[PDB]
Design brief:
It is classed as immune system. The entry lists the keywords immune system. The assembly is trimeric. Crystal structure of beta 2 microglobulin in complex with antibody BBM.1. The structure holds three protein chains of three kinds. Chain A has strands spanning 6-11, 21-30, 35-41, 44-45, 50-51, 55-57, 61-70, 78-84, 91-94. Chain A is mainly β. In chain A, strand 6 and strand 7 (61-70) form a beta hairpin. The radius of gyration of chain A is 14 Å and the shape is globular. Chain B is mostly beta strands. In chain B, strands 2-10-9-4-5-6 form a six-stranded mixed β-sheet, with no helix packed on it. In chain B, strands 1-3-8-7 form a four-stranded antiparallel β-sheet, with no helix packed on it. In chain B, strand 5 and strand 6 form a beta hairpin. Helix content of chain C is 0%, strand content 53%. Chain C contains no helices and eleven strands. The N and C termini of chain C lie far apart (30 Å). Classes of the chains: A mainly beta, B mainly beta, C mainly beta. At the B-C interface, strand 4 and strand 5 of B face strand 5 and strand 10 of C.
């Protein structure tokens, strides 16, 4: 059974403007495993991105963690872009520290 | 630097016919690909973003397809305004290189 | 709308500065790209600037020739071309980035630069 991905965007540590942090994008619960995940800076693909191994559980289906180093700023800018066969077009989820 | 091999370089067709323009990336770029159209006397204009999504105002006879390294631009039912130039562009890794371009000519 | 400055006709070896001024939004709101197009030839990505933090990226082959700047006090992004030769004769477009698209959705009319 096909499952659209669950996407969670958050920082590793509490966000403080001007201080180095890590922007996380956790994608889980999707099937099949073919997926596209990118971290964005005003829609621009961030190129220095790391990611965990593609893992699978019988309960969570497939999951995957992307993360990059970033420095939060006053403005709203950072987001995650996920593309999947269950999506007609790439889905962008903006980062919100109050969320 | 990522290379984009756009083919064909030039194509001729008649009104109503269909055309297919292909762009090949030198490495996987996911769906970070855009298609632009340039008419005589105009700036380039966005047709397709994210490989398959139409921009506002673009007619439904324009279709984008592909993922990874091979991408396609399909134009059905060609009218006189469509016989212009088309360029693909990767937005995966800077520099955001363009394709060589394709000029559509009438019969 | 992306207003661009008037055409330029200059001698070889001279310098020129092309300006790109948006109407309806601030330069600090998005990325501004610059594209070169020789007469009857294809498109060439030069670089882009984030005027909100000054991040600039170039195509490596344009680093010695082109210099992108921003005057946020005047809501203007500029492209400077120096030591002009015949190969620099082209139309130079400035394009506005749209994050939700992942591409440049609106382009300016372009500034024609002619090197005699």
């Amino acid at each position: 059974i096909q499952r659209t991905p669950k996407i969670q965007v958050y920082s590793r540590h509490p966000a403080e403007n001007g201080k180095s942090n890590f922007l996380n994008c956790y994608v889980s619960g999707f099937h099949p495993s073919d997926i596209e995940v990118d971290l964005l800076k005003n829609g621009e693909r961030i190129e220095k991105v790391e990611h965990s191994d593609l893992s699978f559980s019988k309960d969570w289906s497939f999951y995957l963690l992307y993360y990059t180093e970033f420095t939060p700023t006053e403005k709203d800018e950072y987001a995650c872009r996920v593309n999947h066969v269950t999506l007609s077009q790439p889905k962008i989820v903006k980062w919100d520290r109050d969320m | 630097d990522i290379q984009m091999t756009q083919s064909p370089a030039s194509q001729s067709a008649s009104l109503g016919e269909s055309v297919t323009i292909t762009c090949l990336a030198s490495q996987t770029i996911g769906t970070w690909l855009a298609w632009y159209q340039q008419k005589p006397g105009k700036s380039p204009q966005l047709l397709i973003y994210a490989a398959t999504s139409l921009a506002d105002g673009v007619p439904s006879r324009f279709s984008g397809s592909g993922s990874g390294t091979k991408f396609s631009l399909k134009i059905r039912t060609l009218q006189a305004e469509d016989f212009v130039s088309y360029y693909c562009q990767q937005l995966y890794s800077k520099p955001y290189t363009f394709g060589g371009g394709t000029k559509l000519e009438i019969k | 709308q992306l207003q661009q400055s008037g055409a330029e006709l200059v001698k070889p070896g001279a310098s020129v500065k092309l300006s790109c001024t948006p109407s309806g939004f601030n330069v600090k709101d998005t990325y501004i790209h610059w594209v070169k197009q020789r007469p009857k030839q294809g498109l060439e990505w030069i670089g882009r600037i984030d005027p909100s933090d000054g991040d600039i990226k170039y195509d490596p082959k344009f680093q010695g020739k082109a210099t992108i700047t921003a005057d946020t006090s005047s809501n203007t992004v500029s492209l400077q071309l120096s030591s002009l030769t015949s190969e620099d004769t082209a139309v130079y477009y400035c394009a506005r980035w749209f994050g939700d698209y992942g591409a440049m959705n609106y382009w300016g009319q372009g500034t024609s630069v002619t090197v005699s």
